[PDB]
């Protein structure tokens, strides 16, 4: 049976890269998104992102470098309308209105969801515990928040994050202008997540490296003291625990390697979950804390705080962003 | 675009001098036994 042989090949763990059924979806979508991204980043013509006939050039051939180049989001006139190639009268019209962005982000989001499913699938085929995909759900939720959920809440894929470095910075600055994300607790939890993730990464790495058991001489690298597949632990967990328990106090230190590695998984994953949820909840315009004119003296004069200085910076960004796109006093979306 | 001219050769040297250095150290490692 050809179908049985195909099923055996798809689910085979002997392939150099595992495919699986999630990979059967993942490989074509990510290949399409990757090829279209490379082509658009090099050679796409300028895109009228704001829908006001003001095309923004994001490709290398139209005057960009690596830093300033981007795949520009689709037109504000399109909004949330589905804009495939066959909906356009020609490829010139599709390129003018930012169709490549919609193609890339839709294929990428599908392929990355199937990447998460593929991680589960391979863990199941290898007899592993299944929750690496749960850890990967945090950056995937972040990608969904900036590419899909924020355009949905704001009503246009033009407000999605551009596929570029300076476009990303533009997204960040305009987002702070419109939503005050720095004062949002979910973004603060995300900063705690990534700062703590970097801290605990450096901490765990330095504590394991500090307690490596002497297996080599002074000339060779210490990494040759570990052999792949060896049964014994390559470092002294008790010595690292003794060091770190004397560094703070005994009960702030993990003596359990499993609890420590669960904490290493859990802290940045939960923090990034919260910051992705912050982006989505601000997509429905539930913004960060507003303390403008909160402190008032006895007469009634406004006493400024640091929040008022942040408000001045946000006002500068707000009045300069998309400088020709607004006709009315309130930036309602 | 009106870019800096030396930015070509600098970039080339920035690739070339370290990479071949590593390549040298790799190839002489492989010929050892």
């Amino acid at each position: 049976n050809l179908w049985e042989r195909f099923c055996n090949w798809v689910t085979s763990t002997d392939n150099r890269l595992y495919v699986g059924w999630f990979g059967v979806i993942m490989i074509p979508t990510l290949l399409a998104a990757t090829i279209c991204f490379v082509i658009a980043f090099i050679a796409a013509p300028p895109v009228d992102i704001d829908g006001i006939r003001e095309p923004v050039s994001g490709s290398l051939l139209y005057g960009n470098n690596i830093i300033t180049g981007a795949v520009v989001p689709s037109s504000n006139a399109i909004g949330l309308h589905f804009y495939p190639i066959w909906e356009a009268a020609s490829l010139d019209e599709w390129l003018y209105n930012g169709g490549p962005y919609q193609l890339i982000i839709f294929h990428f989001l599908l392929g990355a969801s199937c990447y998460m499913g593929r991680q589960w699938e391979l863990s199941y085929r290898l007899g592993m515990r299944p929750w690496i995909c749960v850890a990967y759900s945090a950056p995937l939720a972040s990608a969904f928040a900036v590419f899909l959920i924020y355009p949905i809440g704001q009503g246009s894929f033009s407000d999605g994050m551009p596929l570029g470095i300076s476009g990303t910075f533009n997204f960040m600055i305009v987002f702070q202008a419109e939503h005050n994300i720095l004062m949002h607790p979910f973004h603060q939890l995300g900063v705690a997540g990534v700062f703590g993730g970097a801290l605990f990464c450096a901490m765990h790495g330095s504590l394991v490296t500090s307690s490596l058991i002497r297996e080599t001489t002074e000339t060779e690298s210490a990494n040759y003291g570990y052999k792949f597949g060896q049964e014994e632990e390559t470092y002294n967990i008790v010595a690292a625990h003794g060091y770190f328990g004397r560094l703070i106090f005994q009960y702030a230190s993990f003596n359990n390697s499993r609890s420590l590695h669960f904490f290493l998984a859990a802290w940045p994953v939960v923090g990034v979950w919260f910051t992705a949820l912050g982006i989505s909840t601000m997509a429905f315009n539930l913004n960060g804390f507003n303390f403008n004119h909160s402190v008032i003296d006895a007469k009634g004069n406004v006493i400024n705080t640091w929040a008022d200085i942040i408000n001045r910076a946000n006002l500068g960004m707000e009045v300069m962003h998309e400088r020709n796109a607004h006709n009315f006093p309130l930036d309602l979306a | 675009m009106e870019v800096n001219q030396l930015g070509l050769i600098a970039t080339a040297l920035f690739v070339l001098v370290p990479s071949v250095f590593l390549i040298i150290l790799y190839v002489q490692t492989e010929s050892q036994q």
Partner: peptide, 30 residues
């Protein structure tokens, strides 16, 4: 001239990805 440089460096990175995946040092389990 600068566009050629960026595309060349990117293509070298992709070639390096290919060699690092398919022509790696095999992890020999001891």
């Amino acid at each position: 001239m600068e566009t050629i440089t960026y595309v060349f460096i990117f293509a070298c990175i992709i070639a390096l990805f290919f060699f690092a995946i398919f022509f790696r040092e095999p992890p020999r389990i001891t």
